[PDB]
């Protein structure tokens, strides 16, 4: 429960829910100085400054990137590409990273918890959750991430449902 | 008739040896639990 306190205290400032008729459908993430928002999530950004923007579309990677004003570029997530195997710290507890795939134990994951970042033990974002499929006792995840070259990579398992 | 017979036997035996060689190349990569076919052999032998 100690890692989930860290995730909630880092999401209290830098994560914004995308509300449609009050209902949560997704989360905009401000990482590295650029706003991120998925395509299929419908609604508006909770923050008033971020809602009045012109988000350039990128339909392949299921993202709608934007740019952050200069007074807000220090209040962003830090991020990295470095990802050894083991455990990472999601919003609902922990998430296993094995063979280049983020897996969460089952039950959790429904319509609405998309766009949530995955943190490491230092406090840096390594992935952004878009969707996932339930492989029985454990749910694989479809995320975007980065690499050592500096290239945004999206991983997508089979038959993933958009969250 | 003998030209047609030699042509049919040659095309059938060459296609049989080609299928044997394609199976003998793609078999040690389809038996692994990940089935990660390398890209050049997937271009050559028409894999997934």
């Amino acid at each position: 429960g100690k890692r989930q306190r860290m995730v909630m205290k880092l999401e209290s400032d830098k994560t914004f829910p995308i509300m449609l008729e009050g209902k949560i459908n997704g989360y905009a993430c401000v990482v590295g100085g650029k706003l991120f928002r998925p395509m299929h999530v419908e609604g508006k950004i909770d923050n008033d400054v971020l809602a009045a923007l012109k988000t350039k579309k990128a339909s392949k990677y299921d993202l709608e990137y934007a740019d952050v004003p200069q007074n807000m570029r220090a209040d962003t997530f830090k991020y990295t590409h470095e990802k050894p195997q083991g455990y990472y710290s999601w919003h609902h507890g922990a998430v296993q990273y094995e063979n280049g795939r983020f897996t969460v134990p089952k039950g959790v994951g429904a319509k609405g918890d998309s766009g949530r970042p995955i943190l490491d033990n230092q406090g840096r974002v390594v992935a952004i959750v878009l969707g996932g499929v339930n492989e029985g006792s454990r749910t694989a995840l479809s995320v975007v991430m980065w690499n050592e070259k500096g290239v945004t990579v999206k991983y997508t398992p089979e038959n993933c449902e958009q969250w | 008739s003998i030209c047609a017979a030699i042509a049919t036997v040659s095309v059938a035996a060459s296609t049989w040896l080609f299928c044997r060689s394609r199976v003998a190349c793609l078999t040690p990569y389809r038996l692994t639990p990940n089935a990660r076919i390398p890209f050049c052999l997937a271009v050559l032998c028409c894999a997934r």
């Binding site: 280049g100 690499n147 050592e148 070259k149 290239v151 990579v153 999206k154 991983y155 | -």
Partner: protein
């Protein structure tokens, strides 16, 4: 004499029909080759994980 079809086509006009119709095929095949190389390079970039 007998008027053959394409009898008076005047090699200048053969050149104008070869350039403005065969050259557009050259444009579309180099566009298709460029698109194929771009798709293979994007897949090579995303081989990194």
């Amino acid at each position: 004499h007998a008027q053959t079809f394409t009898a008076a086509v005047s090699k200048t006009a053969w050149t104008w029909l070869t350039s403005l119709l065969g050259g557009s095929a050259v444009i579309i095949i180099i566009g298709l080759v460029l698109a194929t190389i771009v798709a293979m390079y994007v897949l090579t970039n995303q081989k990194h994980n």
